[PDB]
Symmetry: D2
Subunit: 431 residues, 4 copies
């Protein structure tokens, strides 16, 4: 009863009328969880407890701290992550995100609708960005991105050694919102950094820009993060306010791909509980999603394509709703084939099984993608290697309770090795 009665309502109002607090959700949680790591959670042993509580991405705020400090944070993060590698099935990749300092003023001061002469990427940012490339980070949260000319300046700094590092522009000013479209078309994703946004724009208007930015990225198929202050009271209290709970649930209902925690995990006194709460609420909001309107409106807004993979993805999502599938298993190398299934927001989890660890780590940016890293070696026959990576996803889904033997799942593959060829959709029962 994953709010399936509400998902069959002919109207959006009756769908709300049918929401049932006694109807439990599916064990799979589709929204990524980004926890800012700091003094309260840098310990290697407590980082393990945060992975178990559902952390997907470890955020590193570079507004303070030295490279020697952040390298120890990354060292322990990876130590906690690989502590579960003694198990390929239940292992879970954890990403490393670099939030740059950006154009600041420092105690930090703020100035609304003004010019901000500071450059997009100063030498402090360049030395921090090149540090991330050396540390093998998975993504960059570029702060105070005001125009498209800033993302290109950041992309050039990362260079070709980190060409595959995904850039997440942080909308933090009024100019960034006013010029959001050229920023989104230039970025790998967007973060709605409500923290600094609520000071530059009127606080009563932050919800307008958040829902606008999430929708526009939702139609564009790009990840969007809701950031800062979702459970701020949890910094000193073990339970969030009613407003904070509904904020996390509404961000997931708005369509945000990941939800973020900053002070709640960096310096607060209840970092484990804040991660556990965000996991619980996001899973509940995923059940309350009105997929009947979401899947239709996303398809109607999406254009016709000559791309075989895009056509397979829509058909795969349409097939999953038809048979209430346990998961969408997608063989992917660069994550792209999994990203194209995610943009149509299926209900079932997207078990994106891959061999590239960086794509498994970057998979958390997208809603509903559950990456699994296959350490098995390539078989001589390609057919055997494809079905091996699919059976690897079957064993994972059974262990993580995503589905059981006899259930129906959709498997996405392609006709030849290499990337951009995902074009084969199969409806197979779980062995």
């Amino acid at each position: 009863t994953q709010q399936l009665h509400a998902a069959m309502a002919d109207t959006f109002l009756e769908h709300m009328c049918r929401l049932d607090i006694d109807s439990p959700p599916i064990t799979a949680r589709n929204t990524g969880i980004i926890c800012t790591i700091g003094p309260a959670s840098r310990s290697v042993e407590t980082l393990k407890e945060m992975i178990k509580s559902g952390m997907n991405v470890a955020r590193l705020n570079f507004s303070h701290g030295t490279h020697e400090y952040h390298a120890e944070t990354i060292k322990n993060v990876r130590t906690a992550t690989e502590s579960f590698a003694s198990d390929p099935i239940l292992y879970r990749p954890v990403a490393v995100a670099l939030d740059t300092k950006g154009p600041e003023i420092r105690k930090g001061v703020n100035l609304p609708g003004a010019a901000v002469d500071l450059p997009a990427v100063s030498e402090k940012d360049i030395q921090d960005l090149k540090f991330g490339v050396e540390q093998d980070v998975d993504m960059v949260f570029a702060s105070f991105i005001r125009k498209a000319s800033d993302v290109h300046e950041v992309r050039k700094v990362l260079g070709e050694k980190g060409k595959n590092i995904k850039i997440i522009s942080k909308i933090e000013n009024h100019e960034g919102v006013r010029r959001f479209d050229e920023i989104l078309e230039a970025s790998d994703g967007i973060m709605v950094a409500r923290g600094d946004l609520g000071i530059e724009i009127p606080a009563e208007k932050v919800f307008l820009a958040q829902k606008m930015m999430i929708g526009r990225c939702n139609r564009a198929g790009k990840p969007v993060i809701c950031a800062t202050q979702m459970l701020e009271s949890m910094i000193k209290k073990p339970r969030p306010t009613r407003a904070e709970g509904s904020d996390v649930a509404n961000a997931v209902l708005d369509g945000a791909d990941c939800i973020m925690l900053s002070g709640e995990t960096a310096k607060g006194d209840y970092p484990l509980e804040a991660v556990r709460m965000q996991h619980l609420i996001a899973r509940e909001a995923e059940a309350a999603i009105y997929h009947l309107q979401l899947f239709e409106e996303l398809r109607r807004l999406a254009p016709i394509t000559s791309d075989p993979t895009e056509a397979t993805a829509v058909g795969a999502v349409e097939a999953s709703f038809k048979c209430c599938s346990g998961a969408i298993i997608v063989l992917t190398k660069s994550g792209r084939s999994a990203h194209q299934v995610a943009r149509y927001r299926p209900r079932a989890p997207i078990i994106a099984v891959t061999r590239n660890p960086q794509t498994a780590r970057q998979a958390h940016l997208y809603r509903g993608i559950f990456p699994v890293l296959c350490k098995d070696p390539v078989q001589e026959a390609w057919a055997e290697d494809v079905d091996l990576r699919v059976n690897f996803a079957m064993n994972v889904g059974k262990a993580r309770g995503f589905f059981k033997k006899g259930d129906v799942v959709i498997v996405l593959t392609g006709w030849r090795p290499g990337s951009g060829f995902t074009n084969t959709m199969r409806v197979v029962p779980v062995p």
Copy 2:
């Protein structure tokens, strides 16, 4: 343009206003064409031109003719069909359909016509050997007294003459002529409302169906079905020798309309037989029954046939009326899988012009179909399947619109996998490749399915064998102009030979 400008509309109204007569239909014709064969089309030379003009199913009306007669009809249809079998790429399968006689009621030989004045008195007698003047007519039993009663009305000769039982009668019946006119010999009489005690499959029908199974018919049009047991009574007579023969129940009276749901469940398809239905139920209500039965079969994924008087005036004139051109087009927009011609091709003076006209109207109407709404509502009114073939067909048709593919190539042994794709009505044509000739001939009942018979022998490697059939569809799709090399098509496959395993869908480039 294929009326794609009107397809990208939000409202049905704006979609109606965007309809363009200068928007040429690029797609093939998706609606099946059925044509009754008669003295105007029995010849081989005529039948080949009917195939060229678009005939997908040959209907044989067994209320007239003899087994010897119909046997030569079938022989000529099969001769005309296989005359195009030289090239298997362009070959078109043509099915043969037996239209059961059913529980009809005719009159006696007059004294060739006569005249019954309006308001006069006619004593319908059930006497012995009077099998007829302007006062005393004889029926084929019907047991009219046991089913007739008060001021009941009898309709002689296709409802053109209206009677009115104005008495009771021991073995006769005194009636007043509610609507006059002439009267030929042995004309059919309909008794609306009443429950004709005649059986489901009469002794004549048994010999007909047993003859049809002995002649390898592809489907039967069961006349005057009223209850679900009638379809079972017909399927029993077909037995195990003809268990693969589709049963299309003809809905023709108030009972068959009321009991429609159980009839649809027991039958393989429905024919909206508007001819007799227009006599048994008020003629102004037929469009309601027609739209009701088409939508319900569309909901149930069963074929539905719109039949009779679609191009009636084309029996004597070379062009249809404006009402007839719009009736065919609206039957397509209603959702009819097939359309039918009766006297237009059986005994008319322009049978070819009729088939060509139905092919032309249907192709334009398929462009005017509001696919944006039809597809969403068809999926909404369909339940969660747990069947891999059903889910595969939904994604295939979803990928059909997304990539705007030129065709849906489906490998099918019994047609079922193709029927499940056509259920969701893709704009793109369904190229169903089969090695089973009967499955190719029966695929015509389904809208949008272009069956193609692959006569190539089965290959040893199963991967290479289904590849050979996928290419076979690629060649017939490029030969008939459905798509060119480099286009995107949807190819439906399964994971092992035999039927029931269609589970693979691919978007592959046309070679």
Copy 3:
């Protein structure tokens, strides 16, 4: 049950032939008056059966002949003027001949249908020496400039598109028959695709329009409108004495369809003249043109008529065909304001039967209309307005759906207040009370409007005069069965006497 459906597909499945329609037929019925219906006795029964608008076809007959018909129509109309509660306004429509191309007399004989051999040569000469000397080898047409419009082996259609030819000559033509037939004296010629340069309003149309103003006709059916300038030429010809006469532009050729927007913009309404349209454009595309023009006029709130050959077989048979039964219903479902009858009531054998059938089918079709989508779509596509009348109209239509009212009573001098209500297509009838006789007759053009002519004198207290006409509508609604006492109706009045000023909507109980 059908109106309460979340999907259009389920709306079709819930279409019940056992749900009796409401008492109110909303689609106007336009009957062409001819030799079979000119008698006052027959025109009386035509009004009783449901004729709202009498149409005179000025393609034939003389002014003396039509003036007698108009006299007979008004005699049969005022035959019921004694009780103004049951009296039905019946408008008179003038159908212009327009730029018609006709042939001569065959062998100088007005009723000598000659012959034509499929493929035989036929001379198309302009030499007036063959005017009353047409033979099976030489045919004369009255369009002297045909050779400057028709050239590359083009197609020429004679006798309602039945006979088609292919010219093979030049200079003031050798026709090669492409479809044989039987010619006749003074039959119509169509030149599809070619640009006929004939004047919009010929010297003959001037005399008919002058006659029409003198005869106090309510609307003109301007045949063969090619552009908006033609509509303006008709409007100027009518002048001051001819204003208030509604101009219905007949769309009959490719040019009128291509320029439909400018033509509609300058017209009072549109008539889908499928007869000629089916010859000028391919007959398969006519339904696209009809549905396009019906949708576009619905969006604009202007009347649209679907015409010619709706019940064509009823010229000779008392019962229509199934194609004809569905064409009338689909016209109403398309959203046609009026359906028309031409030869069926002018020269046919069953004029009354044809009017009753159109009434029956239209009333059944009005019930089956999916109002949930139509009222929503017609509202979405309609823009916002500062006009209080427009705001009061939508509010009144939404109110009538909410309380399921029996009627929507509107007082109007011009008719406009009633027209703005009918644009949003309520289910309940619109009883437009007026003291203006022409406004009552012209109201027949709009769907759902049931005009009543109040003849009681105007009271001194305007409020009492307003309340008087409201009670008059209550009386006719009670008398005609639209609603009973205790039911709820919507009443629309204004805040001051005079036209416009309609801003009051009151939900009142029927006394």
Copy 4:
């Protein structure tokens, strides 16, 4: 947000949300404010009326009858301070929040301010013997629920101090409980206790509530916020206690437990309104499910046309800070986008340091969220789900709303005596404000519970001719509308009247230009 409201889809409507599209002047969402020490001065209460307060709430969980009678007198004096100008006077209703079945602890170490430090994993005994009643410490805790043993089994969870402290039982002794602390902290005196998933056999209407309700009827309040209604019979007990003298006062059921939501439909049919009461609800049910219950309740009362309020912790951070939380900003807006009739403030106005900024912030966010409402979808779904009524006013109301959208009416002027006609118009959520004209002060105050109804109380005397009395008020509404900036001269307004004096006869809709 006229561009977002024209989108054919919800997604595009969200993408079209312009942060630079200024809202309308009218704020359609009622603002309820709990009155307390930081809000009781009539100098302050005047400032809250001017900052947007429409309903003043009295939490009868604490305080005595003489204390609350002072607040009411202080509230009423603040409102009548504006009655000098009838064209701008804003009615302010007062509301009585009952205590309900409440479980409070005892005094710690004989003080009211003393606090002990509890530690997770430590032990704490819960006894019902009235001896330790004012001798609580980290070892013995007393609570005033006598039968707190015939409900709590072994291993259950008892929550103390607004759910901040968690206990885990381990032993039951009829009179004692040897629990264990799961989450510790400073334990105070007389803190609230929450027992989730237990048949609290305490009555919904206590003897203290029966006296507080009779005090409410005597004090001429406008509505009753009853607490912890588990069944409709509880609403009937409140209804009977109010009797005939209090027959007009609205009963607003606060759902605060698992039984309330499970029987919400039966409760909503028995009440005149609903309060979500998220505070107690987030403790009795998992906090991650509160948004589900809130959305379900707001939707079901929208489908029914009854008022629903979102309460507790909407701007909680503003108790100590002058600027709210983005989550709190997102929460007020999303409550307005959910369709909540009114939004409430509890600690932010009762004891907070910035009560005025919270009222202003709520009025700001609600004005913005009202513009972002997808009126195209809402008005269609409300009509498709509302029945075909035989009432002439329901048809007039939905007909005026459809006409309001058609001409973009500046407002919908409604003449109402019992407010029922303004309620019927509000049920369909027009964008334009509902200027409701009444001579009934009880009506002009109770109209704040419904969204979009801007109540105006006409103090002019009844003219001799009834048709002249209607035009006098219909002209008063445009005076209020022209002044408060809802429209100007020439704009088109919808006016709803009746054919006869007396309630229940409004059936006339008029599209008129403002003079």
